[PDB]
Structure 1
Amino acid sequence: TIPHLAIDPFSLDFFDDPYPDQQTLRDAGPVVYLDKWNVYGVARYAEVHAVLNDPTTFCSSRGVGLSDFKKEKPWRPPSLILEADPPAHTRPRAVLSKVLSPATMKTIRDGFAAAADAKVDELLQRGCIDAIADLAEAYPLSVFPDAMGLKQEGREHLLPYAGLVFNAFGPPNELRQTAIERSAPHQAYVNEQCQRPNLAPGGFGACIHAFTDTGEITPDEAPLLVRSLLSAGLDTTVNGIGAAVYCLARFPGELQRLRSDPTLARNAFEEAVRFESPVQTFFRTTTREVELGGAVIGEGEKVLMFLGSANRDPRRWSDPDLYDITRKTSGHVGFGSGVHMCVGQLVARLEGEVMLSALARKVAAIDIDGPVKRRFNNTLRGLESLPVKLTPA
């Protein structure tokens, strides 16, 4: 009843060009079985959205990676929000929701926007830059660690730790084993900065500890929630911003439209998240026998969702393979959907908007002038290097 495919969604050939195999997965049926890893797969928008919005049947407490927390030990203490189900998820979710709230965005926007304009002005003085190292990575590093209230010492551990986290959502392949092997120094740094004394006042981390008074979280829960922001809020935005610049470099017509109306900056970034969703796949675990698209899935089974595929499903999107900054992107799953939908999505959109805004107002052309190198990760999609020439407006 369920088609069995040998496609390995965690192979380098899949990372290099996943779109053909993703059509193969979508067109094989609403639910496939991946013999490579003994997990169910759903690649269409309909089933991806259904799974995300049924948290009771497709839980997150048994891990959102391949590993089933009920069968193996998590490589680190489980996240109190990402790897938890309602009701345990509810109160930690509400705290991070308030820490990263609309009101909070107003306190940091000016500094985030100024930092983005300064970076673009700096990059235009150099002309030929690497849109990843010098922009996609440089800008988020200049605003997010400071917004967290982190000290200057040891920030080099942040990106290695984030890449570890997302590699660990994948199967026990080379990418995962190597990341966990080299991980000890990054865990020590991250865990230490999660302690209240090490977080500068007024920052995201200090605000998390400040919510230990309300009865929503206890003091011993705050460090892990700071750990959540250091795990989820840097590497994702880096790939998101890189994807946006990548799209603008490949679709010059859309850059010209963005220039003519910089107020499209926010939707241009949202479209980039749909087009090259930074998080390509993650898992749920069934808590019971469930019928999904005509297929019966047993209890305790891992279900792999193809978020990027769902964002290019022609059953849902018109011209899904076109980057369109005026597209109505509402409904894309680049940030997830349901109770776990990225609680830091307002920070991500703020960084992306103000950066694309700076580009829209200051840059006339973005031309690739060097070898493009991809960055391989079990669950993240992004570039290693994007050599571009920036022409001032």
Structure 2
Amino acid sequence: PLPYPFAPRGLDLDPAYAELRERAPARIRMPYGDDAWLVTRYEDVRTVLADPRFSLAASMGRDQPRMRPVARTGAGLFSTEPPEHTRLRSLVARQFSARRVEPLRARAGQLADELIDGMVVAGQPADLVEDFAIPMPTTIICEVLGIPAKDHRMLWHWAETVLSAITPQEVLATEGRAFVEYMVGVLELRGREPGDDLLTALVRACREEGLISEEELLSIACDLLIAGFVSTTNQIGNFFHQLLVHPEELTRLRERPELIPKAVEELMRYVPLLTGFNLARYATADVELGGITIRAGEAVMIATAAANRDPEVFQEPERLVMDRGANPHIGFGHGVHYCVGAHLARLELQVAIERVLHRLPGMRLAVPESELSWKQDAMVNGLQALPVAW
């Protein structure tokens, strides 16, 4: 069985995936848990994500293929399938819809300008990671959820604990307990002190309409916070890294920002992001796939970055093509667990690029590229620092 996941080399896609896509799904061994089938062919990955015989509910109570020593528990979005999943996801779908995140664009741009101001005053070189990529989306999600600004540093510390694949088992537990107790507290605050935030809406949904349990309310609050903290923070840095090493693409996006949406989608397709956070599904019945049979009770994982370069789906899949037209990438997933944050992340990535490129027309790497350090043992690929001058 193939040891998995591969060790990332920057944001290179591992060359093994090219051969993997042209054979039957492979048997893989993760750091912990059951062995699994690994699916990399685009069509095979879409099938796993859309076919209800592949279930995240069925993985609860199993010895899941995973990165960390303790199998995951919980009763929320990552643990359920329809109809129960639908009941939870319906309650969050209003606030994260494109229609309701779009009014945040002006605020996101104002925040980006404040962060860039801070970089300017601090003087060159700046670090796009610590000075911009981390603060921007963490602030925004906190505002969406009604989380006080004072808790930013504490929550980023928890995010780093969550993000490291070598966090000691007992550190994860003790910090985890503290985080959960923190969120219990916030949910009581929102109960006494209602606001125009998402958690207030979710507290009412639970404690006045009885539409979700307390355990579900808590899991959704925790999930949205953690997701908001570990995802875009890394991806913003990744996208600026890719723009900085393709300077030819910079000036088009700087001068014609209407081109930024398609570029964000191409960068979503191109960037290999998810080293560790790939939830295995368990089959609930035998499924024929890729010429093998996945028996009931077996585990299946997907490689979206590999699917996103399947040459049967994307022309010249290994080329970064910033105006790429046919781009049905799986960078936000597919099926019922399709990213509920997709419109918010999309807006954050577009605004980040628009603001940074306009504010800092002379932006460039402040160190040689070979000197960049990538985060080691991270569940999500990302830079330790991104030194820039301008």
TM-score (norm 2): 0.85
Mean Cα deviation higher: 342-351 or 366-375: 366-375
2:182 aligned residue (177, 189, 197)? 189
Mean Cα deviation higher: 105-114 or 154-163: 154-163
1:226 aligned residue (221, 233, 249)? 221
Are 1:375 and 1:383, in contact at CA under 8 Å, matched by a contact in 2? yes
Question: 1:224 and 1:329 mapped to 2: Cα distance?
Answer: 36
Question: 2:97 and 2:77 mapped to 1: Cα distance?
Answer: 16
Classify 1:66/1:220 alpha carbon distance in 2 versus 1 (closer, same or farther; 3 Å).
Answer: closer
Q: 1:39-59, CA deviations, whole angstroms, 9 ceiling, x for partnerless residues?
A: 1111121211111011x2110
Could you tell me which amino acid in structure 2 is paired with residue 380 of structure 1? V
Classify 1:108/1:381 alpha carbon distance in 2 versus 1 (closer, same or farther; 3 Å).
Answer: same
Q: 1:69-100, CA deviations, whole angstroms, 9 ceiling, x for partnerless residues?
A: 9xx99766514112101111011111111121
Classify 1:26/1:252 alpha carbon distance in 2 versus 1 (closer, same or farther; 3 Å).
Answer: same
Q: 1:101 and 2:97 equivalent?
A: yes
Map of 2:109 onto structure 1: 113
Map of 2:202 onto structure 1: 208
Mean Cα deviation higher: 362-371 or 330-339: 362-371
Could you tell me which amino acid in structure 1 is paired with residue 56 of structure 2? S
What's the CA shift for 1:363? 2.6
Mean Cα deviation higher: 176-185 or 344-353: 176-185
The RMSD of aligned alpha carbons is 3.0
Mean Cα deviation higher: 102-111 or 295-304: 102-111
Whichever structure has more strand as a proportion of its residues is 1
Classify 1:176/1:100 alpha carbon distance in 2 versus 1 (closer, same or farther; 3 Å).
Answer: farther
Secondary structure of the 2:21 match is helix
Map of 1:32 onto structure 2: 26
Classify 1:33/1:310 alpha carbon distance in 2 versus 1 (closer, same or farther; 3 Å).
Answer: same
Q: 1:375 and 2:375 equivalent?
A: yes
Give the total of aligned pairs: 376
Are 1:45 and 1:310, in contact at CA under 8 Å, matched by a contact in 2? yes
What's the CA shift for 1:343? 0.8
Secondary structure of the 1:34 match is strand
1:241 aligned residue (229, 236, 242)? 236
What's the CA shift for 1:319? 2.4
Q: 1:206-249, CA deviations, whole angstroms, 9 ceiling, x for partnerless residues?
A: 22223345564356532322112112122101112111111111
TM-score (norm 1): 0.85
What's the CA shift for 1:320? 2.3
1:355 aligned residue (338, 352, 356)? 352
Stretches of structure 2 lacking an aligned partner (at least 5 in a row) = none
Mean Cα deviation higher: 277-286 or 260-269: 277-286
Map of 1:143 onto structure 2: 140
Q: 1:78 and 2:74 equivalent?
A: yes
Question: 1:100 and 1:40 mapped to 2: Cα distance?
Answer: 32
Question: 2:160 and 2:80 mapped to 1: Cα distance?
Answer: 21
What's the CA shift for 1:302? 1.1
Are 2:75 and 2:219, in contact at CA under 8 Å, matched by a contact in 1? yes
Mean Cα deviation higher: 176-185 or 44-53: 176-185
Could you tell me which amino acid in structure 1 is paired with residue 253 of structure 2? L
Classify 1:361/1:14 alpha carbon distance in 2 versus 1 (closer, same or farther; 3 Å).
Answer: closer
Secondary structure of the 1:339 match is helix
Secondary structure of the 1:364 match is coil
Are 1:154 and 1:189, in contact at CA under 8 Å, matched by a contact in 2? no
What's the CA shift for 1:115? 0.9
Could you tell me which amino acid in structure 2 is paired with residue 263 of structure 1? E
Are 2:373 and 2:383, in contact at CA under 8 Å, matched by a contact in 1? yes
- Which residues in structure 2 correspond to 1:249-328 (within 5 Å)? 249-280=244-275, 281-328=278-325
Classify 1:180/1:107 alpha carbon distance in 2 versus 1 (closer, same or farther; 3 Å).
Answer: same
Are 1:262 and 1:361, in contact at CA under 8 Å, matched by a contact in 2? no
Classify 1:117/1:155 alpha carbon distance in 2 versus 1 (closer, same or farther; 3 Å).
Answer: closer
Are 1:129 and 1:388, in contact at CA under 8 Å, matched by a contact in 2? yes
Could you tell me which amino acid in structure 2 is paired with residue 108 of structure 1? L
Identity of aligned residues (%): 26
Secondary structure of the 1:356 match is helix
Map of 1:170 onto structure 2: none
